Design an enzyme around this catalytic site. Sequence first.
Site, PDB file in Angstrom:
ATOM      1  N   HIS A   1     -33.059 -30.352 -16.652  1.00  0.00           N
ATOM      2  CA  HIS A   1     -31.821 -30.393 -17.422  1.00  0.00           C
ATOM      3  C   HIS A   1     -31.966 -29.696 -18.778  1.00  0.00           C
ATOM      4  CE1 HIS A   1     -28.043 -32.455 -18.836  1.00  0.00           C
ATOM      5  NE2 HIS A   1     -28.634 -32.239 -20.001  1.00  0.00           N
ATOM      6  N   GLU A   2     -33.019 -30.044 -19.532  1.00  0.00           N
ATOM      7  CA  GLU A   2     -33.250 -29.448 -20.863  1.00  0.00           C
ATOM      8  C   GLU A   2     -33.545 -27.948 -20.751  1.00  0.00           C
ATOM      9  OE1 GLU A   2     -31.961 -31.231 -23.027  1.00  0.00           O
ATOM     10  OE2 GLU A   2     -32.194 -33.194 -22.081  1.00  0.00           O
TER      11      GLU A   2
ATOM     12  N   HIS B   1     -30.330 -26.039 -20.199  1.00  0.00           N
ATOM     13  CA  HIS B   1     -29.682 -25.674 -21.459  1.00  0.00           C
ATOM     14  C   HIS B   1     -30.340 -24.419 -22.011  1.00  0.00           C
ATOM     15  CE1 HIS B   1     -26.976 -29.020 -21.888  1.00  0.00           C
ATOM     16  NE2 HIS B   1     -27.935 -29.958 -21.944  1.00  0.00           N
TER      17      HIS B   1
ATOM     18  N   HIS C   1     -23.124 -28.683 -19.860  1.00  0.00           N
ATOM     19  CA  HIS C   1     -23.008 -29.841 -18.996  1.00  0.00           C
ATOM     20  C   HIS C   1     -21.924 -29.613 -17.955  1.00  0.00           C
ATOM     21  CE1 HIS C   1     -24.841 -32.603 -22.277  1.00  0.00           C
ATOM     22  NE2 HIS C   1     -25.810 -32.130 -21.483  1.00  0.00           N
TER      23      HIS C   1
END
Length: 251
Positions: free
Chosen positions: A182-183, A186, A192
């Site tokens: 997820h990080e 980004h 998101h």
Amino acid sequence: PDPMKNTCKLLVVADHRFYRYMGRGEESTTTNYLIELIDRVDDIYRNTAWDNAGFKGYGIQIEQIRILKSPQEVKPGEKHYNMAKSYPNEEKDAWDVKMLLEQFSFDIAEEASKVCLAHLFTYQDFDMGTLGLAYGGHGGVCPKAYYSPVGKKNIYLNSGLTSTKNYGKTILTKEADLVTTHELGHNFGAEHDPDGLAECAPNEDQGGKYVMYPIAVSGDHENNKMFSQCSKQSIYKTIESKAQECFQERS
Ligand SMILES: O=C(NCc1ccc(Cn2c(C(F)(F)F)nc3ccccc32)s1)[C@H](O)[C@@H](O)C(=O)N1CCC[C@@H]1c1cccc(Cl)c1
Ligand SMILES: [Zn+2]
């Protein structure tokens, strides 16, 4: 795809908290955990067809692991991401996540300028279930300078962080893999997944949420480990713009 420019090399940093609580105060245990985690996250990236066709084989590789065995000694009123105390509230187990990411980026600037990404692995219980933070989705892959007026130097926004502690306990390895995915998502340019786009945020019967969902909702549904079409579209543009800039050949 350029096989000579398809890997984002990483500087992986384990702080004293991670070394003590995840590494059991040992270099081998610390590094093995991180090496395997990044390799599993790399499988998700490398197997993703960003354009739903032949644009695949893009991923991540550890270039270096910095292991911080003990807290960073600080002078009065001075701060550092590896210092013993949390900031701004020393009575709390964890830093304010946004401030920690800014601090890490400041302290690692020299090293961060020489790598595609820098990722901090820590062990602190951030408020309200937060597990990580990263720049991008300005910032992300390939160091982009930001002149810090407070810091009085250039810092680079090619940074992110993962904590493997949540609600007073070590998260499962299957959960930690999703945090880092997820990080780094980004960093790779993804935002998101919004509720208003059902394709990008499915119901549980439809396989569940994708990795870029804002809430670490599950960890056991099929889609949880995958990027939505929303993430693929965003990341597709970033890789097209950034691979030539700082990506290297897979080792
Ligand atoms: O802590 C965060 N995410 C961790 C995750 C969310 C979902 C992930 C995968 N995932 C899923 C599942 F999703 F697959 F189901 N189920 C999971 C179960 C266990 C582990 C992972 C899981 S990891 C923040 O989003 C951070 O990156 C951010 O942008 N932040 C942080 C502060 C400001 C900003 C921010 C900005 C806007 C809104 C918010 Cl909530 C936060
Ligand atoms: Zn997020």
